[model samples]
Target: GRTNLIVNYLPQNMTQDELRSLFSSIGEVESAKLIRDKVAGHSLGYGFVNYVTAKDAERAINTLNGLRLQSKTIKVSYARPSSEVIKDANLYISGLPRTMTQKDVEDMFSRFGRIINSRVLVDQTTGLSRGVAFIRFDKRSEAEEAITSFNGHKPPGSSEPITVKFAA
Candidate 1:
């Protein structure tokens, strides 16, 4: 079977062609994609590289897993299916207050349950909040409770009620 590997800790400046060429030295690369923001069109610092064969993918992983590029240590591992990788405890929230920090977002949602992680999106150029946040709970029940309770609740600093949903 064809193998796809997740390549993380990539330099933001690295291009798809560069990634392909780097992996090609170890084996045949079917495709390389650097995940990017649709709006600002900047690299997300991670991506997928699919090799022509599973053996080749493993070879590349073994060869370059900890190699440094652009002053950053890279991580390479076999990509898991989304079904196996994505947990139901994660949530997507929109209509967040632009003033909300990552801590504020986490505090607002922590009432429901223990939070694993929370992040408010920021503009890479401006370093301003994007009015969107992601929250991952330690338990699926907590995430469900958050969705039910906060879907239409407007936080103190928010202009509009927050929309909450399961993260895909």
Candidate 2:
């Protein structure tokens, strides 16, 4: 019934308490959490705000979506159900080198564990890498391990390290 809203484009310095306080102004905030990196404990630039009622969630979405927060435009929208959430074994990758191929992605990730499948999205018109990809591991543990080790790790031919997260 849309009691939760996914919040994005947050400043790295934003805190869960600040998020809760901001959202509470619109309605009763049941909970708020800022997703963070496991090791470094830094915000992942996104979070979730759950309200006590669907109406409150909607109000927050209506009022807060696209509002500038710390010089960044914030986005708020309904949160998907747990079943609709990304699977534990599925990973979303960004900042991939344009030169990378599907095979290269598979080979890079396979080092962590067995890859069930992997694909790098390509631009239809240009036949170039879309700079994004998805990788599914045979086991959830494997995917978690890959996220921990490979996130922010620069790949061959890439000037910047990649960002890895569970597909959303």
Candidate 3:
């Protein structure tokens, strides 16, 4: 019964205005935003809509779930704010070459699920892969998949297989 709800993905090339138009059909929309990256200024493929009432928000979820808008099916759910919320408990990661950059670490994890945040611990001066990194998943299942699928798999040119575990 939250007034804030999140929707993921719109048509690949859909604009914000088009997004507003679709959600407005259900009720009074206070505000809606398709999340965009600061550097690229492009939609990150997810967004949120705020309604005046929780009831209206519920209606929006019912109307929109599984309903294709802009030619892409998306996920819609309530949004909650927390001072410390763990989006995912763990992350599965591999396929990283020895020269993988920090941004590479971030990007690879983002592909699996929404990342609350991450840090690839590396020697500041050297900036080399420490042969270890920690990733958080948006959902626990994603973390499980990463663990199950990539846990023992090593990428090309690496002697040791990747390892995944919950970040302490």
Candidate 4:
């Protein structure tokens, strides 16, 4: 029996009140909340809606999934339990010049914030930059800001843009 559903691909600007009003049409909504990043404090593009009964949850899903709402199409479905959620903390940096080293990485990310630690994955025998590295910032806020501000912008002097995320 369903107790809650995680609606993905949601409108970033939608308010909790709007969500409650929309889902209530299908059944009794107990509560609703948009999941947000603890650091950035921005919606993670998804939300959870809890219903009073499994039947109501199904009704909401059936009627609302893939339905357009607030200029963005909605994707409603069952919410996953906390244990199944995966936390992303690893960031991957690419398109480095062959000469770039781990020290360079530390220096680059440090501009954003203090680097708790950083490592450029390298071949055990060859001792060369794998063109990817994981960086940990002193605070999650720093990492999230880097992710948002650098989302589409490529790093200076690099042919490839980098991707930031939580480390596994």
Clashes of 3: 0
- Note the residue pairs that clash in candidate 4: 88-166, 89-166, 89-167, 90-166, 90-167
> What C-alpha lDDT, on a 0 to 100 scale, does residue 16 get in candidate 4?
76
Residues 28-80, model 4: lDDT tens digits: 88999887889978877788999999999988888898998768888887765
Error of 1 at 21 (Å): 0.4
The TM-scores, one per candidate, come to: 0.53, 0.53, 0.55, 0.50
Q: What is the lDDT of candidate 1?
A: 0.87
Q: Report lDDT (Cα) of residue 32, candidate 1.
A: 93
* 2 against 4, candidate with superior TM-score: 2
Estimate, for each residue in 1-168, the C-alpha lDDT of model 1 and write its tens digit: 649998989998999888889999988788999899999999999889999899999889899999899799999988766563345889999998788889888878989987866778999999899989999886788899899888998888556998999986
Which ranges in model 1 have alpha carbons more than 4 Å from their true place? 83-168
**TM-score for predicted model 2 compared with the true structure:** 0.53
lDDT of each: 0.87, 0.86, 0.72, 0.75
lDDT of 2 by residue, 1-168 (tens): 779888989988999999889999998888899999999888999999999999989889899999998789998988655552234789999988888889988888888877756779999999999889999876777889888998999876668889988887
Better of 2 and 3 by TM-score: 3
User: Residue 26 error for model 1, in Å?
Assistant: 0.9
Supply the global lDDT for candidate 4: 0.75
The segments of candidate 3 whose C-alpha lies over 4 angstroms from its true place after superposition are 82-84, 87-90, 93-150, 153-168
Candidate 3 displacement at residue 40 in angstroms: 1.6
